[model samples]
Target chain A: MTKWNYGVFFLNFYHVGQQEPSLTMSNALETLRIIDEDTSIYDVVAFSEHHIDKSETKLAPFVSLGKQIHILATSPETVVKAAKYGMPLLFKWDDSQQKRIELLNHYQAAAAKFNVDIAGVRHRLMLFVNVNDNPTQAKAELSIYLEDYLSYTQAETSIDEIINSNAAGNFDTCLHHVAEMAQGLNNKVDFLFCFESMKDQENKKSLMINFDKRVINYRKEHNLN
Target chain B: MTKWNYGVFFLNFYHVGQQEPSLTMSNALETLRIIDEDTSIYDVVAFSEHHIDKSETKLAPFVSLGKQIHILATSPETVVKAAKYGMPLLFKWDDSQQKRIELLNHYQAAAAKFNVDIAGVRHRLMLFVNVNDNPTQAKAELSIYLEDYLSYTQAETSIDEIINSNAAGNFDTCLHHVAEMAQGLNNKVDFLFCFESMKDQENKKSLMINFDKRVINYRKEHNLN
Candidate 1:
């Protein structure tokens, strides 16, 4: 059996088949069908972000997912997962912004409905990480779309946030917001869950010490590390 | 010593490290500089085509290559290639009619410039297979913009005519045009190539045979095959 560790990368929903399918079909559907058919051969499916390319077929992730739900009726075996990494550097514009958020909220309402209607398969979403130090004179001003708050729900693990940010496209902000939520309730989450990207085996020892030092400092300052 | 074939793909035109000494002082140049400084590990640079996208930063292939020439001057090993797989499928109004000849001439001229400017560097452009079947069909008549063939000279290949009647999507037309060009006396003089969709491999195979068949049949009919 193929082991699936879902991931997202840049892929065109159109051009999967020899000819571009009817404009009526979202490129995401075409992508989903391709994944459903190919799952026996490959382990996972990932959708990456791209803007209007040579073809004006730049896709909105959730709307494209919604179209796939229509076809997943019998494809139960091919449980698909959405991976969040490298969402478009650009934000949405025009009527697409509203349409994208609306689809996102509709999907979040019910995972099953969202899968059946949007992505075609129910799978965990992976939130990818790429954090560098913050370097502004002031703290980061986070922006949250109104629609995201409208459909907000607390997620216990990073997996849930991964799924949420798959549509949100701002994983860092989503993390910040979720941390805010964690702080609102007196139940604090700690660094026990997350890990860092280390260079190699030789670096592992130092990384452990570094991690320990940070944890000790946090525990001293915040009374829990 | 590196093998010649392996090194070709690794060639690039941009020099990194410090920006002050950099000649081309554009955002794209600065971006290249950072990527270079962060890692002395880069081979070639890649850019794509789009009338609009993030920053609308890409330049026409020839023009951009022109600018890159100075950056890559010291680095004889680097070259740039355009992401030509999909795009405004190359074509202009009146492509298959009288103006197709003009477009070919322009391509030949551009190729000459590209080869000349980059002298020893490797460069490539993509050929987009357009979607419109009949430029003059009533429902999808040749859009008037195509009437001005001169303006589309920048496009590597012209999707001048719609596909012929027999093949769906007028794919037959696409094959015939490529075949005719491949066999034409002035054919091999330029860099106009067309793309095959991910699904079009079978179609492309059949067309490859068609090109052979046309030459064979033509020779057999005239005792030239």
Candidate 2:
């Protein structure tokens, strides 16, 4: 059987609506600690922003909390540190696929220079997701949460912008979109479903379950996992 | 006024007695939050270990918590991030003055490369001290805590080893040691007193007060702030 990994952003899920980054970080640790209690759903933990320390020492506790630690790299220095520390990395999703590839290559270059094995290293692409059976229904509901989330950060964002950047549609639509995204990438990087645009716990749970059942299982069957 | 910036190790003081680094980081943040409530003693918070994130976004809250945020940079990568983020830095002390000068020059190189102002930047040399009237009484009491501290990390450090790394002595001895240490440095840098060797709250409090009264006050009277 092909081994696959799944991860979640503890900061986005548990630290939602928090204005203070420190408090959010504090809540992130607790969320990770609880998630560590049950590793059936998540094999990795992903953190957004440059400030998240992906160091083995800083992440030592979370080592048992999750199987792996990933940081979303925003700068070249971050890429260097991530590579030197031998932690897998996630780059922000940009409209230009070439830009993301450039970052991945930089990470690879750093890893190579640091004498770290590249084969075992895991890299991921973050995809904003809102999973439901009805495409319109999912977009409508997910936008509300996205706006709420943006409000907390004081970032000006619109529903159209969110839809353009994220996967917001029915279960089959999102699954197919993710599959298409995976196919477009020349590299063998995995996907990390970001539910920050999702607020309702029930909806979030259903989304994960559907993705696991339809998307992940389908990929597993096709040896994509 | 010399405007001396007094900072504490967010890792050693609060993260003490923790085996896991994540727990230590969590404790460090919480401890920093509690310390933030009172800014009378600390003008800045310093973090050691290469793993600590020196990002502006990560240390944003602590910015208001104290006058400044400093990260102890042990590598060129850390210095780069610190320069980019515009955070002041703390460099570990070494017996070899030339080696320490090399590290400081690297920091300056990064600062120049990043276009950050060197004059406004704050740099400190971490000098571990145990300030008491009686040298023997201080060393005997501090070694116990040092052993306790070493046990948490499972580090094979002896009392003598700790004493050598740190300036463990009386007020006069520590004062003179710091003065000589300062003189050896070619570049202008201040000192950060690390009393991790003293675990007792009362002893730690007294140590700080004594250092402030004798060392700090004497320096201030002599234009050291």
Candidate 3:
């Protein structure tokens, strides 16, 4: 049986903006409180990564998670955070391959002990490629650049396939590589994305849905699925 | 005397929970394309209002204006769009007193036009509201429901003083009282939006900066500039 689950990503509250308050674990705790006040339909919570305590936000991720569980156990909305809902954690890794794999295993072990569910790991493709300043070369470099992370992450996670974010490649090229990766993995890999900078939300969503239909049709043609 | 310039409210491209294609018009036509091709410093471009086709987007605002004006006429770094930005016109009506003055003139004349160099007339505080699914309200009573062309077409511009969105009563109140009357005005107002929806980009912006003093405190106590 296949389960197609939908999840939402909540960026690290700390990485908001210099103009606003850095969303600390304190803020994340408050958010859980608000979600309790309103019956949120979201199934999971996800956060992003950045190594910038250079700006003075030294709040660690698990510290907030512990607090989240603590508040849920005693709060007004005592069902999930407090009692019923289990934490299906999806940790996003924007780090090197070795470090990412190591971190994933560490978190997976911790999740096992803490009762947190490791939904899966998501890796960002190109954090260093400057698309705006170097589009042509960036696009050329990124198509294959994406291939490295994709291939390696697939092997490391012990999962035949995984999800791919366009990250910073040319739109069509990233889509092409994503399609190819899925095929090479014998149609095991799939993808989900928020789109490249969400240039136009509606257009991007339609394109994603359109891409999904095309992929399904391709699968039928090749008898891959 | 110094003019009171309000900070720009970049219209949130994020329309929560809607599955539609998103579109945006820039103050310049080729800004996004050019920046995506040429520069790496661009963050986002500003959007403005139109009367008949708020839903219609010809080009990103900056690129559109760049086409109409000379390269040297505007700075490449900052392109501001408004009524005079070669697209369409919009006005600012401060409150009921101003509306009454225009009404005494039979609502046929322009209020005040300034030659100030800035973006377009942001809709002044909405006495604006929304009545999305109010069963108690008649079709004619709701802004989205009013069928009469005058009540329908003339009044659909952006609210300047909007405090809440469709989820709250304040928005509903503003929509019913303040935004409602604009429908009966002389010329039908145009609005701009995309016909579809898209996923919001993962906000990579971080909130951490100098933590010793907060923005609120700096602005109120000391001084920003």
Question: What Cα-based lDDT does every candidate model obtain?
Answer: 0.27, 0.53, 0.28
Docking class of 3: incorrect
Q: Please say which candidate is ahead in lDDT: 1 or 2.
A: 2
Q: What clash pairs does model 2 have?
A: none
TM-score of the B chain in model 2? 0.59
**Per-prediction DockQ, in order?**
0.02, 0.04, 0.02
> Candidates ranked by TM-score, best first?
2, 1, 3
lDDT string for model 1 (A1-225, tens) is 112222222222232223232321233233333334432221233232222232221111221121111111111111121212111111121112233334333333344544334332332222222222331200111111112211322222323333333222233453464344323322211111111111122332333344334435554676541
Candidate 2 lDDT by residue in tens digits, A1-225: 234445564323223443344444443333344344422355444434322442133322211112133545566665766676666767564233445556677878898898988776657777677776778877776666445445545554544654655578877777677666555544456765566455555566556665456545656578863
**lDDT by residue for model 1 over B72-145, one digit each (tens)?**
11111111221111111122221342333344344444446555332233322222232334423321222222
Q: Write the per-residue lDDT of candidate 3 for residues B105-224, one digit (tens) a residue.
A: 321221223244333322222111222233233222332321122232344352222112211133245334433443433223322211111111111011111111233444446544
Q: Which residue segments of model 3 deviate by more than 4 Å?
A: A1-94, A106-218, A221-225, B1-225
Best by TM-score: 2
Which 10 consecutive residues of model 2 chain A have the lowest summed lDDT?
A59-68
Q: What interface Cα RMSD is found for model 2?
A: 13.2
Higher-ranked by DockQ: 2 or 3: 2
> What tens digits encode model 3's per-residue C-alpha lDDT throughout A1-225?
222222223333222212122222233334333333332222233222222121111111111121121111111222122111233222232333333334334444555666755354222222221132334544444343234333433443421122232334454665555455334323322222322222233443444455455655655676664
lDDT of 1: 0.27
The TM-score obtained by model 3 is 0.25
- The residue ranges of model 2 lying beyond 4 angstroms of the native Cα positions read A11-39, A45-67, A84-86, A93-99, A111-117, A151-162, A199-201, A215-225, B1-225
